[PDB]
Amino acid sequence: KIMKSEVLRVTHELQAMKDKIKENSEKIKVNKTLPYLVSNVIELLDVDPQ
Amino acid sequence: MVLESTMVCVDNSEYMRNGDFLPTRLQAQQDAVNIVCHSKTRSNPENNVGLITLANDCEVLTTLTPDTGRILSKLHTVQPKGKITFCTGIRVAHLALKHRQGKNHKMRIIAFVGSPVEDNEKDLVKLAKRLKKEKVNVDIINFGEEEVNTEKLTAFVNTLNGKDGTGSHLVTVPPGPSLADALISSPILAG
Amino acid sequence: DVPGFLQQSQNSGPGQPAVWHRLEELYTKKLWHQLTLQVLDFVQDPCFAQGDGLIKLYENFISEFEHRVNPLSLVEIILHVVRQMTDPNVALTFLEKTREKVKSSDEAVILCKTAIGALKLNIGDLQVTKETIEDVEEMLNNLPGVTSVHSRFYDLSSKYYQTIGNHASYYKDALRFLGCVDIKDLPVSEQQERAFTLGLAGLLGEGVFNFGELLMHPVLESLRNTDRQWLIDTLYAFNSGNVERFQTLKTAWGQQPDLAANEAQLLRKIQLLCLMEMTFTRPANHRQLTFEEIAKSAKITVNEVELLVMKALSVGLVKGSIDEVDKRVHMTWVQPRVLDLQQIKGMKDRLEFWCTDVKSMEMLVEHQAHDILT
Amino acid sequence: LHKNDIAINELMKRYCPNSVLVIIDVKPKDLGLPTEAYISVEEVHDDGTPTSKTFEHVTSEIGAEEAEEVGVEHLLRDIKDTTVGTLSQRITNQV
């Protein structure tokens, strides 16, 4: 089980990600709170020539 | 409470995985760092704990901070390369003690030595003269050995240990299958 | 097997207990690193290679299940096992067993494939070995350039140099072997043949035009002083310019094998050194010349100078284009590539002259120009 | 350029992508351009030396996009613009 000992670092990086997403995921409520007006959307596919 | 900085240096050589001694004692001394950092946290949570190795290319693993939540994660991926390096191992922390936030925190650096020293007596008396000159508390902890335990390190400590009144202590652990936590926790430095 | 190892470990030959004492002491102390160092000390000693068949398999299994020490020592000792036994049938299963045994901890696949290809470089197969050699040089090109694995790669370029198929690669890798030498710890008795096939390999190398890079490094001129000066003389003549044909003729007929067919190509190679030297000797003062110096120095007729300059322009080291009417020789940009001391002294003279002329014009124009315009 | 710069730059070579190096002067006495872009890439040497970190000089230019030209021009009030003609040309032709 000496080869599977590196999984703990991966889990620490994952839980560190879940611990660090609270800020940038928290600003969604204060930045995207409410659209103050209404705007109509018309779809038109464009081509640039990722 | 007590206002002082804690610096620990662990060995990353391949001498820490021998089957005669403890079964990969790296985790045992890791738990020692855990109980001394949690013990200092229970005494005074304002103390910062740093992590760095003694390899050829020294790398600052964790900056001095009281938050051990990420230090517990940084204790992994030790990158077991190199054998031993003493000069820049002392100079990488004893000179970096000025980068701490709190200037009132005393200077205290420990180190886990798991490989024989390659420097001659001249480097021992020069580095010992520098450490005694700048008056930094130095605790010598030697895990594992090949030659005799203390031949020149005795004079290294006696010439390095100043302020005999409540000064620094020497930690010498004998061979044995028992854990090292209770043996290194005996002096007053732990707790 | 630890209690059962004392029987066959204690019983040995007359001189074996000298190392078996510390071997069994470090064995009882269970110091895997000191045990490995003692194993390398036992293999390094010139043993009789008769009673080691037990310690090779015992230390082989110990090195297999220890999973502590760098398995590169296991690669070395298994190279001594396959070298002592000379059994290529079990070498694939042994080396493959070491590949399956070594986990994903250290980048040892370069030495594993290096040992596999090195053992496969015999008369059995060459193409697949060259392909896996290209794989060896292609996999790991990162920062750890210890060059030791690349020195073994140079040994593989020597076993590949045994083939007359491609000689150019042995010179390109021979420059790396020329630059990777650290000290003189290895026996010079091998450096005799190393400099022998290195000088002959450099001469027969058709992938370079100048030889000043080989002789330029002091290690070869310092390690060839003991050997006979028959090669240093012809290398200094082939490097500093061949103005005569007697020495290059005697050394052109001295080496009988593999030099008769390549002699003409070597002449077509050295026929350009007189050109680059004759155009770089005079930097100024009517650089324009005539074919009399080429035909006189190269003892060639007038009808072949057109093919000579055509080959000179065909190689690509010179771009000379002459708009002459009567026979003339005008050259262009060229590189010495070896050395020029008179061009260093002349470089200081012409450089100081150019600098003091630019300074003279700056003080001349700026002197009154700064006072009248500012 | 000290030898320790390979260890200083090696950290930002491991954690960060290929880092560019810039050497400047502590005293503004150098007349030349103070900025020199030195890319941290490993190059193969012909003489056979082991592969190490090589600092290749990359050309650099000092320009401002929108506002820093206005701020610098307002703070100086002594420097002149291009001003094609006699003085801006003859000064370059003299110095």
Side-chain angles (χ1 to χ4, degrees):
Chain A
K1 65 182 181 180
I2 190 167
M3 188 178 73
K4 275 79 175 176
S5 179
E6 294 293 327
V7 184
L8 277 76
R9 178 65 178 170
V10 177
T11 60
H12 286 88
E13 291 179 353
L14 293 176
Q15 68 182 358
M17 192 69 202
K18 270 78 174 177
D19 286 331
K20 74 178 73 174
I21 51 97
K22 292 182 181 180
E23 291 85 4
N24 54 9
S25 73
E26 194 270 331
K27 74 178 187 293
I28 307 298
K29 297 182 290 294
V30 297
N31 290 117
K32 271 73 71 176
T33 164
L34 60 96
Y36 77 103
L37 62 84
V38 176
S39 180
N40 193 0
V41 177
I42 293 172
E43 183 66 27
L44 190 145
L45 183 62
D46 197 359
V47 51
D48 186 74
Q50 183 67 41
Chain B
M1 294 296 172
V2 51
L3 294 174
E4 65 183 1
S5 66
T6 300
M7 290 297 291
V8 60
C9 185
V10 295
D11 192 0
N12 56 3
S13 66
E14 60 186 359
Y15 293 164
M16 307 297 283
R17 290 181 289 116
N18 48 3
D20 55 355
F21 287 164
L22 278 77
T24 312
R25 89 289 296 273
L26 180 64
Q27 187 177 2
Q29 62 183 357
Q30 180 180 0
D31 292 331
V33 177
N34 293 321
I35 62 171
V36 301
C37 77
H38 290 88
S39 178
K40 292 293 183 182
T41 303
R42 290 291 299 274
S43 69
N44 193 0
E46 295 293 328
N47 295 117
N48 48 3
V49 175
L51 184 63
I52 196 164
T53 187
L54 50 94
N56 193 1
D57 193 0
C58 293
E59 298 176 356
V60 177
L61 293 175
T62 302
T63 316
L64 284 80
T65 180
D67 194 1
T68 187
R70 59 184 179 271
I71 299 173
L72 292 173
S73 66
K74 294 294 187 291
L75 289 173
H76 199 72
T77 179
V78 74
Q79 293 179 356
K81 65 182 181 180
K83 296 183 290 294
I84 191 168
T85 309
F86 196 69
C87 182
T88 197
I90 282 178
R91 295 180 184 271
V92 80
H94 289 278
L95 188 63
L97 288 173
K98 293 182 184 293
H99 293 88
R100 65 185 183 273
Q101 183 178 1
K103 294 181 176 67
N104 202 4
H105 293 88
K106 296 183 290 294
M107 295 179 285
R108 183 184 294 272
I109 295 175
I110 65 170
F112 290 163
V113 176
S115 297
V117 57
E118 293 179 353
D119 290 332
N120 55 3
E121 188 177 1
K122 291 175 71 175
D123 291 331
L124 293 174
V125 69
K126 287 180 177 67
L127 290 174
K129 185 176 174 66
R130 180 67 178 172
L131 293 174
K132 186 179 184 293
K133 180 67 174 66
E134 63 181 3
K135 292 181 181 179
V136 173
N137 192 358
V138 177
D139 291 331
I140 294 95
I141 296 169
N142 293 317
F143 285 163
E145 75 271 14
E146 179 181 359
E147 203 67 28
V148 70
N149 296 114
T150 59
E151 184 178 1
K152 296 183 289 294
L153 278 77
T154 300
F156 177 73
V157 172
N158 288 119
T159 54
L160 188 141
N161 191 1
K163 192 179 288 293
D164 199 3
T166 185
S168 67
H169 297 285
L170 181 61
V171 176
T172 60
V173 49
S178 296
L179 294 175
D181 294 332
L183 274 75
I184 67 170
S185 179
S186 178
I188 203 167
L189 56 93
Chain C
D1 292 331
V2 177
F5 189 72
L6 294 174
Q7 287 82 17
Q8 65 268 17
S9 77
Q10 184 177 2
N11 290 318
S12 63
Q16 278 74 15
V19 297
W20 276 97
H21 280 91
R22 295 291 185 269
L23 186 62
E24 73 182 1
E25 286 292 327
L26 294 174
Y27 183 75
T28 54
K29 292 296 290 183
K30 204 179 266 78
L31 293 175
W32 301 99
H33 187 272
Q34 297 296 321
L35 185 68
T36 301
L37 292 175
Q38 189 62 255
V39 167
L40 269 72
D41 289 331
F42 179 74
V43 177
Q44 187 62 255
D45 289 331
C47 295
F48 295 99
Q50 184 178 2
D52 55 355
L54 294 174
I55 195 169
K56 290 292 180 68
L57 185 63
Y58 289 163
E59 291 294 328
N60 192 359
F61 287 164
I62 290 169
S63 296
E64 281 180 354
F65 89 101
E66 68 181 1
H67 66 83
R68 179 184 179 273
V69 191
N70 196 359
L72 303 184
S73 296
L74 180 59
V75 175
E76 293 179 354
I77 194 169
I78 202 166
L79 285 173
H80 293 89
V81 167
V82 72
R83 184 178 292 171
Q84 183 180 2
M85 188 64 72
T86 67
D87 193 1
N89 290 318
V90 297
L92 277 76
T93 62
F94 287 165
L95 292 173
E96 185 178 1
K97 187 180 289 293
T98 60
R99 290 178 63 88
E100 195 270 331
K101 182 64 70 177
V102 172
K103 65 183 287 185
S104 296
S105 66
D106 52 352
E107 294 292 327
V109 70
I110 33 93
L111 284 173
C112 291
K113 290 184 183 293
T114 297
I116 292 170
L119 267 65
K120 284 181 170 64
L121 277 172
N122 201 359
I123 204 167
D125 195 359
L126 293 174
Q127 180 180 0
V128 179
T129 67
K130 185 258 289 181
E131 184 178 1
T132 190
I133 279 169
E134 186 178 1
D135 185 74
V136 165
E137 69 180 0
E138 188 67 28
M139 282 299 291
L140 291 178
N141 291 319
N142 290 318
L143 71 154
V146 185
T147 319
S148 181
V149 59
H150 196 78
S151 178
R152 293 179 62 87
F153 179 78
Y154 175 75
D155 291 331
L156 270 71
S157 74
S158 296
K159 297 295 289 184
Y160 183 75
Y161 174 74
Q162 296 297 109
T163 307
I164 320 295
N166 192 1
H167 296 285
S169 66
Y170 186 74
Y171 184 76
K172 300 284 103 175
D173 201 1
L175 296 175
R176 180 70 68 192
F177 179 74
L178 185 143
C180 75
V181 52
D182 291 330
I183 54 173
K184 309 296 185 291
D185 56 354
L186 63 98
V188 185
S189 179
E190 294 293 328
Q191 288 174 354
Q192 184 177 2
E193 287 86 5
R194 290 292 183 184
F196 187 73
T197 193
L198 183 63
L200 291 179
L203 181 63
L204 293 175
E206 296 295 327
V208 72
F209 62 95
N210 194 0
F211 289 164
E213 188 175 2
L214 187 142
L215 189 63
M216 184 179 72
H217 209 278
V219 298
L220 290 178
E221 67 184 1
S222 68
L223 287 175
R224 282 197 291 266
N225 55 3
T226 302
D227 290 331
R228 184 65 65 192
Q229 293 179 356
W230 71 273
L231 185 62
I232 297 97
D233 195 1
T234 186
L235 285 175
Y236 184 76
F238 287 165
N239 196 4
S240 296
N242 297 112
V243 75
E244 76 272 16
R245 293 291 182 268
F246 185 75
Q247 292 183 358
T248 190
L249 187 65
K250 289 294 183 71
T251 197
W253 287 98
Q255 188 67 256
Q256 184 63 255
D258 291 331
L259 197 64
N262 296 115
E263 184 178 1
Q265 189 175 3
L266 288 177
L267 292 174
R268 292 182 179 92
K269 181 180 69 64
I270 65 170
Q271 70 182 357
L272 303 175
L273 184 61
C274 66
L275 296 177
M276 59 179 285
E277 287 180 353
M278 80 180 284
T279 188
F280 201 76
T281 298
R282 299 290 298 274
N285 297 115
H286 187 73
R287 186 189 294 273
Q288 183 65 254
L289 294 174
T290 186
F291 288 98
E292 293 179 353
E293 185 68 28
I294 297 171
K296 182 176 73 175
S297 296
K299 63 184 289 184
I300 202 66
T301 188
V302 190
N303 290 318
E304 292 293 328
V305 302
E306 291 85 4
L307 278 76
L308 193 144
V309 300
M310 185 181 288
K311 183 67 181 294
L313 295 174
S314 296
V315 174
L317 56 91
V318 65
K319 294 180 182 179
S321 66
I322 317 100
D323 201 359
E324 84 279 25
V325 176
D326 189 74
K327 52 181 179 67
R328 290 181 185 271
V329 177
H330 181 74
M331 290 292 109
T332 51
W333 171 68
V334 73
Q335 186 177 3
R337 193 66 178 85
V338 43
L339 189 62
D340 272 325
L341 55 95
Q342 63 183 358
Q343 298 294 321
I344 286 170
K345 294 181 176 67
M347 181 181 70
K348 295 187 286 185
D349 185 74
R350 181 66 66 192
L351 183 62
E352 194 271 331
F353 185 67
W354 193 275
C355 183
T356 193
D357 284 329
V358 173
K359 185 185 287 185
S360 70
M361 293 299 291
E362 190 270 331
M363 293 177 70
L364 192 144
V365 175
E366 193 267 334
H367 185 273
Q368 63 267 13
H370 182 74
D371 291 331
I372 67 173
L373 295 172
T374 305
Chain D
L1 185 67
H2 285 89
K3 189 176 180 180
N4 202 5
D5 289 329
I6 189 168
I8 299 166
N9 200 3
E10 188 65 30
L11 187 143
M12 290 184 184
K13 186 177 180 180
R14 297 190 305 271
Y15 292 99
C16 300
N18 46 0
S19 296
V20 64
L21 196 144
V22 174
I23 293 171
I24 60 171
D25 195 1
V26 292
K27 269 76 176 175
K29 294 181 176 67
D30 194 1
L31 192 143
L33 208 152
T35 301
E36 287 89 0
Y38 294 158
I39 190 166
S40 177
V41 293
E42 292 179 353
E43 294 179 353
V44 175
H45 201 273
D46 199 3
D47 201 5
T49 62
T51 300
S52 179
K53 189 178 287 184
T54 303
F55 289 161
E56 184 178 1
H57 174 71
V58 178
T59 182
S60 178
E61 64 183 1
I62 303 299
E65 197 266 326
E66 181 68 28
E68 193 173 4
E69 285 179 354
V70 179
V72 166
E73 185 178 1
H74 179 74
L75 288 172
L76 284 173
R77 283 287 184 265
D78 198 3
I79 199 169
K80 196 176 284 189
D81 292 331
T82 302
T83 66
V84 179
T86 172
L87 55 96
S88 296
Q89 193 172 4
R90 74 175 181 261
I91 288 169
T92 61
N93 299 131
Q94 285 178 357
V95 195

